[PDB]
Amino acid sequence: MKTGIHPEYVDTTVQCGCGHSFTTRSTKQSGTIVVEVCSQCHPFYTGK
Amino acid sequence: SSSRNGRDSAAQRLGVKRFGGQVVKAGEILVRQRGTHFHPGVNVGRGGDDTLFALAPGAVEFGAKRGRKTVNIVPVARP
Amino acid sequence: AHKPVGQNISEVRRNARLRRHARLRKKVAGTAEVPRLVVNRSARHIHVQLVNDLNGTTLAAASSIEADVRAIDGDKKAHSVRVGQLIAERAKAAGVETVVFDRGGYTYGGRIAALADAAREAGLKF
Amino acid sequence: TANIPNKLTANVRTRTGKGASRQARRDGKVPAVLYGHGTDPQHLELNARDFAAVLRSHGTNAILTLDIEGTEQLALTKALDVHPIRRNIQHADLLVVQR
Amino acid sequence: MLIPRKVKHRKQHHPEQRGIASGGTSVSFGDYGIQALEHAYITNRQIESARIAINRHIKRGGKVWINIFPDRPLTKKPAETRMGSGKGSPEWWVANVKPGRVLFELSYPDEKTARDALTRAIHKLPIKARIVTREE
Amino acid sequence: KALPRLKQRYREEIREALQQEFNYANVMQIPGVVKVVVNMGVGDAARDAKLINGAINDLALITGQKPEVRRARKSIAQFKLREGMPIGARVTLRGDRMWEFLDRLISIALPRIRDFRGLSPKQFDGTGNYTFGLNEQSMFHEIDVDSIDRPRGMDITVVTTATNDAEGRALLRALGFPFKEN
Amino acid sequence: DVRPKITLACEVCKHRNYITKKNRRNDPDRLEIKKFCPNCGTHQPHKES
RNA sequence: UUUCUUGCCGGAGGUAGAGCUACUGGAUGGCCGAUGGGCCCCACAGGGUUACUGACGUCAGCCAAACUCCGAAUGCCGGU
RNA sequence: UUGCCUCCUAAAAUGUAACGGAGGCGCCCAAAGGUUCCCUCAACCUGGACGGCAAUCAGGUGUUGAGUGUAAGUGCACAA
RNA sequence: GUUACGGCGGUCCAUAGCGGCAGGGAAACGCCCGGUCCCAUCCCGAACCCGGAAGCUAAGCCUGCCAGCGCCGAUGAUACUACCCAUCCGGGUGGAAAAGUAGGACACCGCCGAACAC
Numbered sequence: 002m003k004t005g006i007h008p009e010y011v012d013t014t015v016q017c018g019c020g021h022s023f024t025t026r027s028t029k030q031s032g033t034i035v036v037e038v039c040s041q042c043h044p045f046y047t048g049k
Numbered sequence: 050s051s052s053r054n055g056r057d058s059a060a061q062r063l064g065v066k067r068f069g070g071q072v073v074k075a076g077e078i079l080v081r082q083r084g085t086h087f088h089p090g091v092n093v094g095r096g097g098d099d100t101l102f103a104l105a106p107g108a109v110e111f112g113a114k115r116g117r118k119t120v121n122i123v124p125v126a127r128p
Numbered sequence: 129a130h131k132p133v134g135q136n137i138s139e140v141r142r143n144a145r146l147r148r149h150a151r152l153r154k155k156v157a158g159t160a161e162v163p164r165l166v167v168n169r170s171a172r173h174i175h176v177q178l179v180n181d182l183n184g185t186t187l188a189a190a191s192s193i194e195a196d197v198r199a200i201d202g203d204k205k206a207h208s209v210r211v212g213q214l215i216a217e218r219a220k221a222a223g224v225e226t227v228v229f230d231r232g233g234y235t236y237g238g239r240i241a242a243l244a245d246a247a248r249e250a251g252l253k254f
Numbered sequence: 255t256a257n258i259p260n261k262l263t264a265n266v267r268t269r270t271g272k273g274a275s276r277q278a279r280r281d282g283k284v285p286a287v288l289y290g291h292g293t294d295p296q297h298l299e300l301n302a303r304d305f306a307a308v309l310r311s312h313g314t315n316a317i318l319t320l321d322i323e324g325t326e327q328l329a330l331t332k333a334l335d336v337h338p339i340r341r342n343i344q345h346a347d348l349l350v351v352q353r
Numbered sequence: 354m355l356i357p358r359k360v361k362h363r364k365q366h367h368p369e370q371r372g373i374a375s376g377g378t379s380v381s382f383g384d385y386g387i388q389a390l391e392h393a394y395i396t397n398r399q400i401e402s403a404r405i406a407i408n409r410h411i412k413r414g415g416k417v418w419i420n421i422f423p424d425r426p427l428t429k430k431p432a433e434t435r436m437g438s439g440k441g442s443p444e445w446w447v448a449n450v451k452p453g454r455v456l457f458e459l460s461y462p463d464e465k466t467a468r469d470a471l472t473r474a475i476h477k478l479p480i481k482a483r484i485v486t487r488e489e
Numbered sequence: 490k491a492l493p494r495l496k497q498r499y500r501e502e503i504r505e506a507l508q509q510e511f512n513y514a515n516v517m518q519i520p521g522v523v524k525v526v527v528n529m530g531v532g533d534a535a536r537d538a539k540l541i542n543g544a545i546n547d548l549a550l551i552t553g554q555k556p557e558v559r560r561a562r563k564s565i566a567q568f569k570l571r572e573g574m575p576i577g578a579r580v581t582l583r584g585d586r587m588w589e590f591l592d593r594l595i596s597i598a599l600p601r602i603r604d605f606r607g608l609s610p611k612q613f614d615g616t617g618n619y620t621f622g623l624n625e626q627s628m629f630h631e632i633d634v635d636s637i638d639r640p641r642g643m644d645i646t647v648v649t650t651a652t653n654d655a656e657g658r659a660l661l662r663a664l665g666f667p668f669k670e671n
Numbered sequence: 672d673v674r675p676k677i678t679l680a681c682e683v684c685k686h687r688n689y690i691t692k693k694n695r696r697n698d699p700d701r702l703e704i705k706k707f708c709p710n711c712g713t714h715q716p717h718k719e720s
Numbered sequence: 721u722u723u724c725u726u727g728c729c730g731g732a733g734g735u736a737g738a739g740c741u742a743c744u745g746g747a748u749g750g751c752c753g754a755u756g757g758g759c760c761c762c763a764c765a766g767g768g769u770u771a772c773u774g775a776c777g778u779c780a781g782c783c784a785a786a787c788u789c790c791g792a793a794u795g796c797c798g799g800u
Numbered sequence: 801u802u803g804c805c806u807c808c809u810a811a812a813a814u815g816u817a818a819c820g821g822a823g824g825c826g827c828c829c830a831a832a833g834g835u836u837c838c839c840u841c842a843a844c845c846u847g848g849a850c851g852g853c854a855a856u857c858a859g860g861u862g863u864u865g866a867g868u869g870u871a872a873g874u875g876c877a878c879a880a
Numbered sequence: 881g882u883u884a885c886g887g888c889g890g891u892c893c894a895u896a897g898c899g900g901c902a903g904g905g906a907a908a909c910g911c912c913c914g915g916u917c918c919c920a921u922c923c924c925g926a927a928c929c930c931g932g933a934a935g936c937u938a939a940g941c942c943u944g945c946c947a948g949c950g951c952c953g954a955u956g957a958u959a960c961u962a963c964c965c966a967u968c969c970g971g972g973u974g975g976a977a978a979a980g981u982a983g984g985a986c987a988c989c990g991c992c993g994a995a996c997a998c
Contacts, residue, residue, distance in 0.1 A: 028631040043600035052439030069731030084874030113892040237919035287956035338378035338453030517938040530856035577856025786808035793961040
């Protein structure tokens with residue numbers, strides 16, 4: 002893994018709208034994102 | 050009404066100069082060729098213009114390696 | 129009913145390693161006076177072998193398989209250093225001081241360099 | 255199903271080659287080589303007229319009993335070299351047919 | 354007519370009229386055939402004439418094969434020109450025919466009509482030619 | 490220690506589920522997803538080469554590592570292409586980053602897709618790999634929708650050790666990919 | 672022109688040691704390159720005259 | 721006798737011959753089967769329907785001087 | 801047309817003529833030279849919004865194909 | 881001395897390849913897990929390194945068998961041809977070509993290391 006040519010990559014936590022948490026690394030430096038639908042609440046996954 | 054042809058380069062007098070079994074001196078030209086029709090074998094070098102020459106004294110031999118014809122020099126026993 | 133389709137990375141690595149070894153062998157060859165130190169480096173062990181490509185006959189050989197090298201603790205590089213020392217000693221014994229080193233289609237960044245340096249300090253010209 | 259093999263006298267060849275074959279054809283004998291699983295190619299001369307008659311009466315796939323100096327050998331006409339102009343059988347490749 | 358779509362070299366040396374034909378010497382398509390007995394540069398015009406003769410003799414039924422193709426260009430220099438000043442332009446398209454070569458083949462139910470049509474073709478041709486048959 | 494959500498799920502449950510479904514003679518046949526390749530082919534770079542920089546930045550922000558700029562091995566005049574013109578960007582993800590990108594792509598992006606009705610599970614390679622294309626690039630939080638430039642039909646593909654379409658679909662369903670079952 | 676026969680002269684011995692072609696369009700500026708000055712007996716930087 | 725003749729031995733060739741599904745340019749058939757035009761079922765989903773223009777491919781068959789998967793005889797170069 | 805290079809003619813060493821059959825030229829490259837190391841697709845499928853005869857792409861084999869500063873003999877997954 | 885165990889090297893480099901069927905892990909050849917350690921990605925620990933045996937012969941590896949594809953391939957004959965004979969034809973002496981069937985072949989040896997019994 003190269004030293005600095007590789008862009009930063011920090012672990013982050015996200016919370017969906019239905020209230021499901023999620024932890025994963027993403028380019029977002031803030032570390033706290035707010036996702037709306039997510040796959041735990043999307044209609045396609047849930048049913049119908 | 051004439052011909053667009055009529056040109057031709059000098060014959061380059063290529064080919065094998067020392068054939069199998071001929072005793073040659075070191076540095077002797079063995080094959081004048083374009084490309085490696087024959088490849089440099091043992092005690093045989095390849096010139097800039099693809100001229101195969103003997104690197105050591107001996108007798109010219111023609112062999113085959115990996116399906117490629119090669120020119121080798123077999124050392125000649127001292128008398 | 130399972131049929132492999134992808135060329136396994138092991139097979140790719142073997143084919144490419146043989147490819148690189150032949151590429152090197154175009155210029156590197158062993159002789160009675162200046163043998164060829166072939167190196168085979170696996171994920172487990174490292175082996176080296178002084179070949180005379182004129183006869184295809186080996187004069188000396190060393191391996192990490194040996195009980196001595198296995199007893200030697202440390203790292204893979206330590207074992208490769210011991211193997212290099214062993215092959216240098218055995219080349220001395222066989223009467224071989226200068227050879228050509230065949231890296232077998234490998235790189236600096238591993239055991240090959242360590243073995244090479246082991247033979248250097250041992251006394252072989254490699 | 256099958257049929258009686260056609261009898262043909264096929265003397266062995268004392269001399270073989272281009273001149274020998276041409277002389278045999280001039281004499282009126284088609285040269286032939288009999289080979290097969292026995293692994294023993296034999297160089298024979300079949301009477302040209304009789305051999306051609308057998309071929310044209312029973313076809314190329316006609317089994318032949320060749321009398322080769324007394325011995326009888328079954329063989330089928332594996333191949334026929336025929337001259338395109340003279341239309342004569344230049345040569346016969348016979349394949350032994352063990353029964 | 355029969356003319357190649359293209360030729361790699363349009364000014365070729367004359368085909369060597371030597372030896373008997375080594376290939377195409379038997380009827381491989383039809384029942385009857387016309388076997389050449391002499392060497393000749395059979396031109397595309399001669400091929401056209403022979404095939405038209407065969408087709409017009411057999412009228413309605415039957416099938417005709419033309420084994421030889423005139424893909425060899427014989428050149429001709431302009432009229433009343435002296436020797437030299439290059440090679441002439443392609444003039445004729447010929448098939449190098451050798452003895453033993455089967456030039457045309459015919460399938461037709463009536464043997465007499467087939468032979469008469471092949472005889473027409475032979476008369477159109479510039480060589481000695483015989484009617485050979487598939488049955489050997 | 491640390492372990493991606495999807496990677497841990499695969500190491501703990503998915504292998505057993507796939508073994509039970511497609512009982513293999515040996516454990517090593519258990520399909521295991523391999524490098525994930527995400528690409529943006531510009532095509533119009535011949536007219537606006539600047540788009541390559543935006544594609545590079547977007548791919549970096551989406552994946553986590555720099556995108557390799559891929560030139561053209563051919564020069565077809567029909568589209569105004571010459572040998573060496575940067576014509577796309579490619580990112581290969583392997584290991585922890587691969588699994589984390591898969592986890593994010595399944596848990597964040599695809600649900601955020603506009604009018605998302607899933608993709609038919611017929612785009613599999615026929616040898617075990619699955620390729621599809623995202624209709625935009627704003628579904629990823631790293632690509633903030635407020636500062637986007639244009640739409641880039643984003644090619645994605647996942648390479649697996651599967652042997653064919655069946656094992657590939659089994660693996661991806663186990664990983665939990667949306668599928669427009671048909 | 673186009674590819675003039677430029678003359679590479681050393682910086683130290685200042686001897687016009689070599690002559691070689693160079694495409695003035697691709698390399699308009701004087702060709703500075705390491706070469707062997709026999710007067711100096713060693714490799715020295717040579718540049719176009 | 722280094723010359724030459726003959727025998728034998730070592731040698732490189734791409735000619736004559738052919739062979740071409742071995743390359744680069746060709747040849748009668750039908751074939752899973754390309755644009756399929758055409759009947760359309762009447763889907764713009766999707767599909768047989770191909771009387772005829774007939775893709776790749778395939779079947780014995782054929783040619784070349786600037787074709788060669790091959791390949792002599794002579795000639796030539798050496799040694800004896 | 802005149803000099804040079806390549807091929808065929810040229811008759812398998814070399815050489816071989818014609819106002820014989822074809823072409824090239826007479827430049828270009830400072831990174832297309834040296835060295836060291838490494839590689840790897842020619843075309844069907846699934847596809848890959850757009851992006852079919854094409855993309856960034858992914859797999860398999862096509863077994864050495866394929867293609868490769870400027871025409872013959874060479875060089876390949878021993879890589880000129 | 882032996883093994884379906886290993887590497888290293890072997891031929892005018894396919895009679896050896898491709899494909900199909902069956903079999904193996906004590907030690908080797910592999911497979912494989914996370915980046916504290918050299919080193920690397922025109923991005924990616926995929927290729928190269930670190931600690932390994934918690935686990936595996938699926939693949940590579942190699943063993944046996946299939947002649948299906950490829951490969952090799954006679955003898956004979958013919959083509960061709962050197963010389964010679966021959967008024968136009970043609971013939972003699974010598975040399976002598978692919979396909980196929982007959983066929984061959986699913987390759988052919990030495991160095992050293994491991995265990996076995998001595």
